[PDB]
Amino acid sequence: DIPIPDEFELRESTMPGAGLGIWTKRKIEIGEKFGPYMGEQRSDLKDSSYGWEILDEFCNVKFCIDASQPDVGSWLKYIRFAGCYDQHNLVACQINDQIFYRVVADIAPGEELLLFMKS
């Protein structure tokens, strides 16, 4: 399987219909980063699925990182997306052509890790 760190728990997300999410047992402070997001390098994400675009100088796609398939990826693939404004505690950022998730609000023990809502 895809291993989940001991400091996190994989269990039912509070996002309706999202399935299993990632929950912390430790306090997580603003400014911590997680990753890199892992997966197969692809030209695009036709199946939106689980994945991120990596961008060049000009904000155009250099390539994409796709974790569609169940055996590929890291525990970050299970972090779900907030549904509301300021419901999230993570944002993606890009460093050396890899995606990391940056903590933007404090996460107390027993709370779900949630990315910035989709458009």
Curated annotation (Swiss-Prot):
May be acetylated by CREBBP and KAT2B. Disruption phenotype: Mice develop until 9.5 dpc but die before 11.5 dpc. At 10.5 dpc embryos display multiple malformations associated with hypocellularity and reduced body size. Required for neural, heart and paraxial mesenchyme. It comes from the Eukaryota. It is found in: Nucleus; Nucleus speckle; Cytoplasm. Disulfide bonds: none annotated. There is a cross-link at K27, K118 (Glycyl lysine isopeptide (Lys-Gly) (interchain with G-Cter in SUMO2)). Residues 6-118 form the SET domain. Both zinc finger regions are required for the transcriptional activation of PBX1. This is Histone-lysine N-methyltransferase MECOM. The lineage of its organism: Eukaryota, Metazoa, Chordata, Craniata, Vertebrata.
